[PDB]
Amino acid sequence: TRAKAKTRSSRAGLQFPVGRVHRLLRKGNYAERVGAGAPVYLAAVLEYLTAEILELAGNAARDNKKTRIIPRHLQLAVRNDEELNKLLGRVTIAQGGVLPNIQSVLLPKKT
Amino acid sequence: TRAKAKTRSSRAGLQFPVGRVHRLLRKGNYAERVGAGAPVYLAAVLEYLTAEILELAGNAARDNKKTRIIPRHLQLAVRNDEELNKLLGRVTIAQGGVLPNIQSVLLPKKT
Amino acid sequence: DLTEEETVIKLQNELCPLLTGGQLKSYQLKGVKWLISLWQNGLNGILADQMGLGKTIQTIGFLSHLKGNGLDGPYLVIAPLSTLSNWFNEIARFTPSINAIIYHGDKNQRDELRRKHMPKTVGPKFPIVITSYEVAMNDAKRILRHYPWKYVVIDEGHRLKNHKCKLLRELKHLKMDNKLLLTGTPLQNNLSELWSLLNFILPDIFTSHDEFESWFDFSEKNKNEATKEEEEKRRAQVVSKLHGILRPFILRRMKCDVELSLPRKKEIIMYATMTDHQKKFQEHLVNNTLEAHLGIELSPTGRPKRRTRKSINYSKLNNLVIQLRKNCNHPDLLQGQIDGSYLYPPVEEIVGQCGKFRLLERLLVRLFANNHKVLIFSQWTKLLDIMDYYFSEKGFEVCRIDGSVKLDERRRQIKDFSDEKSSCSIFLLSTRAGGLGINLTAADTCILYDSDWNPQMDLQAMDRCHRIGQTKPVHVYRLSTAQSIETRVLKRAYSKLKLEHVVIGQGQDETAEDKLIQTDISDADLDRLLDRSDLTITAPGETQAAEAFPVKGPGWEVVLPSS
Amino acid sequence: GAKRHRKVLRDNIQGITKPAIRRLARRGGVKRISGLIYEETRGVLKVFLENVIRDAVTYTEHAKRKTVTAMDVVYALKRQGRTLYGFG
Amino acid sequence: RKVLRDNIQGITKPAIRRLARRGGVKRISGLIYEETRGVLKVFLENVIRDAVTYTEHAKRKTVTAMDVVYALKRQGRTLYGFGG
Amino acid sequence: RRKTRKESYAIYVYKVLKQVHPDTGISSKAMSIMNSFVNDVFERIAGEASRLAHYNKRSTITSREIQTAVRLLLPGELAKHAVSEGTKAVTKYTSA
Amino acid sequence: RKTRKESYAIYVYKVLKQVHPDTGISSKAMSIMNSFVNDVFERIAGEASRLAHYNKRSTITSREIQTAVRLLLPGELAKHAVSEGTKAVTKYTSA
Amino acid sequence: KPHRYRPGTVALREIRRYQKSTELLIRKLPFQRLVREIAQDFKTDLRFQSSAVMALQEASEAYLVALFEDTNLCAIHAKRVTIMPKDIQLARRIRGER
Amino acid sequence: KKPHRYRPGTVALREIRRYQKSTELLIRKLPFQRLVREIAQDFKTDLRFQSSAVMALQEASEAYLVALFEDTNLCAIHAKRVTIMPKDIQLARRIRGER
DNA sequence: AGGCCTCTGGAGAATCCCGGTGCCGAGGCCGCTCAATTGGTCGTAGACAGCTCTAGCACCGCTTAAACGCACGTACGCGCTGTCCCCCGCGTTTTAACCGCCAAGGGGATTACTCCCTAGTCTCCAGGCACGTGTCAGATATATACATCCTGTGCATG
DNA sequence: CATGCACAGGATGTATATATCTGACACGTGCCTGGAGACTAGGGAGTAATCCCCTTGGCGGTTAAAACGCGGGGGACAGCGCGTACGTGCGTTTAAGCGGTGCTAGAGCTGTCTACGACCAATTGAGCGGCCTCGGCACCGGGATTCTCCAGAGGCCT
Ligand SMILES: Nc1ncnc2c1ncn2[C@@H]1O[C@H](COP(=O)(O)OP(=O)(O)O)[C@@H](O)[C@H]1O
Ligand code: BEF
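Above: inputs. Below: predicted complex with beryllium trifluoride ion.
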């Protein structure tokens, strides 16, 4: 006579999977035992960061008159912001270029 | 009927305490099981490193005709040696001072 | 009734009026008729005459017959690079009233030829096009795509034995009315690779791959009550079905009964024994010590002294098989790093280290005593270099062909050597590069320095000196190393032939070996083994010559084809 | 009639050739290059490679395998101090 | 319950001179001091802002040496001589 | 024989994308990079929380430790929005 | 009052007297040594944990410790530490 | 006479191009040979997956690029525009890598 | 007789040789303590500082500044000058990756 | 008679968009199953109230070393010129990567089966940790001998 | 006739050597809490046996970078001259630094009691392998627009 089952994610309103996060947190021996509130808190943060980066990536990709995102777009989106750049100060992205810039002294004279 | 107890450190021939290391490993939640062999190995390694540092520190101290070691001596011993300096690349020792060093260009002209 | 010659002449004139270079042979005329019938019925087909029977002239006659009726059209011919000049010369010789061009060269030259000789509008002056594989592969998409190819001839068909081959995919861009696929060895190592040619030629029939796989049984089930005689019954039924489903699409003819005027040939194996120098390397390699063959302090208080500790006052199995094969071929292939750019060792030292080289040196001296000429084959160029250096030291003449020699240089040397006035007597060839197509009738002896994994490759190489136009008996010597890994590979190789003999007919605790392989050939036996008298053609009415030497003996063994 | 001199190949480290170094420099934003950098760059690169190959080999050895794999290189890089995305 | 203001001026020039000498400098320009004071303030802000966060979590009201030594270790520099 | 399955965040990342740019798509390489990013962030946060809990001799992990770890790691403005999102999620979850 | 706190004080002194018979140490140096030992121990254990985790193992055995040392200590120090560990473990079993 | 640009013009044009593309710059086969050579010293008869070689390449290339970028600033500091070895040595020394 | 006076630059070398031998602390106590107290007042209003933490903070600050000046001095010699200027500090901090 | 130049005024060379066919990687669809859910105990970390009692935060006074302003020289920083070698740009060829293609077989993953190390309880007892004293290194005071930095005649101009 | 080297003394700033006298550092006890013998279940982990993938060695051909060589302009170094902005000293001031007392406030222990979170069985369906099908991109080929680079005329002079 058990009622219809509803996933915890649906109950909380998030998109990421609560159960998988809880399982990983337990089996990873990060602590002796895990409270009931942590996975819900963690999933929201992960979702927020993912959406934050994807919005800028999509804007940059659209600006170039193209439909599908590719790593160059991620590089441009990340390195043009002063906060995401500080968070990822040590990470390297495969097949990403570099921001274009030239020292002012090297440019030719006005003539 | 009980035989007289002998400490594990005595049987292994080391000086450091084997039991305490074993207790620390289990309570530290590094893994759910600990083998019977690891503590002896770890204690031996720690003892060797401590002896290595102290031998150089003592030599440094006796040079200045002192008798008891003080932090300056440890600083000199660590920074003069090659491998130890690389190992302690990001460590600051309280009241250590710095090694004597002057750039050659600043010295007075020989004339 | 008219004689055979007169009837052949009249029929040739009726069917091939433009052909004037020379008369066709009877079976060639029959093949021409077969091709004409196949074309009339609108069905493709393979031609698989044995090597050296003159397929090129038959194809040329068929083409002349086609154009003889005014059906001008764009014709394409593809062949290996080394043979193009031969195709051009044959056309120039037999049918002087036809034009052809060798569409090969750099991009600019190809564009020049396209603009000059290949007008967009077909006409009677349109020449035949000849090309290699790579050129036809690169330019298929954007140049050759723009023609209505009337007829296509793909020489050396066995190059398409892989269904995943890229070349087999590029050709789909072209649209071709009919295909013809010449070859000399239709049946490769395993049955699957045979389906590719049939699928390419007749897609409307041999569609399903799994059906072709399942149509023949190779289960080898135990001889149970119902299977005791099935071992032979099923085999016979399968062979009969295969022949019956292959009869209408293939033409095959054999030398042994078509050209009885041609002298025969024999294949001979001769063994050699390893030297102590090679045994040393073998032992070191087995123990993983070849490189080695070529190759604490206490501080005060009793503690070990750390190395380079400052003392100053403070104040103030991975590749064993290939290694063994290299060792068996010649020791010097190894240790290629010790001397770097420096010279090869002294001439005399090279001979003393390799058994096979010693045997070859012993064998060569006698052949020159009777004015014979020999061809030497190999697979590894670095091995060719050592022989070249040795012969240059001895001061003999040499000619060489391989992948690093340009087209014009290849062509010049063949013509020079074919000259009767040439005094050259040694010719070197790479197996893959020069083994196909070319004609070297001048020589009458072939030597195989090593054996390939695939037996079919060797068969092509042997026939380069035994074809129409030959006038003397031919001997083939294959060298091998006694009691070594060489035997394993050679034994495995012949295992693949049994399937060919089963499928294709001739028309449409020391063992005994341990007592023979080890034995080196003595000088007295060697000087006796060179007799070729029995292979000569008997005069009419005379009895056959007796066998010159027994089938097998110490250090040598004749090979008899399966039949 | 080839002469008695063996074939020889350039040393492996010489494979990295001058135009490649120039191309690398341009991406950095360099306008003029001196003549001696081509001997410093190779020395720097050879030193850099060992500090990663050693750790990769040690990780492979511990697992009792005989073939290196991508995860070993990624772990070595991450431990050394540099993180790499796109290969996990 | 008093208030504090403008204490950054307390890093007198001779102190900066003495610090420089230990580093091996011989001759010093006139504009260094203003840059050095700003650099020092920027450095201190980050360590203090993490020590406070560590303390407040445990609900204590007094900062202790263990919090400071913990804070430094997170920024890649370790200190020996006060705890572990 | 296909038993060796693999788990990843591909589906969820794809789901989030459609909420911001409905008509856009993403290639495989970008998907792999995005997948790798999430693991790194999760590992950092969990690792920090683990040692934060032990420092006080407490045994369990609760939302408080996660909140403090997030406040410590993320720099500048990102901390405030993340904390607000987390609290807004948990409060809604509890009431139902 | 008087709630005990644990440290490595005695063993450092024992080793010192074993090396240099007549030398002594002030308290400040003792504190530095006490911190250094803990730091090295933590580094080694932390490395060993993940090294074991990567391979789906559950236990921590001497092999993990031996592998971990070769990654941390640079060059020369690696050899002698491994030698000492092997010697100690070998002697322990036969006792 | 034939058209001929003044010195320095082509370098800027190359810079403005190579900063727009993401492809690899070093040739593959020589790099693979070098990687195989170096590793063989530590242990014999190893085998490499292709993706490992690719990872090593893309890891080293982005390190060399950054090193060259940090070097250029030092040259401008001394009133020059050319790079010289002392610049690389100083940059590495300050970075703390040696 | 003129009042005996050394030539410029001599006393600097004596100071360098002297201060590199001792291990004292170079900044005053009370000014540094007041500076530390002032900054923390922004994050919380009534913090209570244990007497030991201030020493650790002072040690860390001195150890950082000494290394920064040492690197600046090397950066200065590169241009053939001998006096350090703000450009050198800015370049050093840019290279180290802090800015 | 002769400059020094803007300002064209072309002339040549490099990206740049614009339209037209080909192609294979992304997006749904389907089938299957193993990993979250839902109820239920059971023992426990962890709030919560009530007590000690250590130290950090003030206040006062007093000696007295560091700060803080000047007023001189001087040696370094900066700019302007010349000279000369070296790096860039552009033409001819030669050399080796890229694929394409032949073969073979080592080592990576699974799936069963069995056993010998580790966990978790009990006793039992001795090794390490606060309190307690007692000397003697090392921090200061003083006399001074020695080493080091600086300028003023000396020589040689000739 | 305004230079470049050699010495003289002669004032200062270190390291000698001898004598006083603290207050840490070393050593003893007396307990306890935590380590050390026996005993008992369980299940990771070691060890065969086996597929099927993916790696390792070599030849053929092309063709677009790679190597050489040559001209010539400009950037890297020496040199010299000018003029500040620092570096030794000497008085005058100001604030650390030491040495004692009071207080509370807030950090540590101790004893309860309860809501929370591990474990087990029985359920489904949300999440993963395969497999087609088509458009976003990917060539091509051809006409624009930008941008350098050098020669001649005449401002305004000399
Ligand atoms: N009818 C002929 N008259 C003269 N020579 C002929 C004739 N037919 C064939 N040949 C010879 O056959 C030789 C090779 O031709 P061919 O058999 O077709 O080569 P392959 O079969 O190996 O591809 C040629 O040298 C040619 O001289
Ligand atoms: F085409 Be034939 F084999 F020359």
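Chain H touches chain B through one residue (CB under 8 Å).
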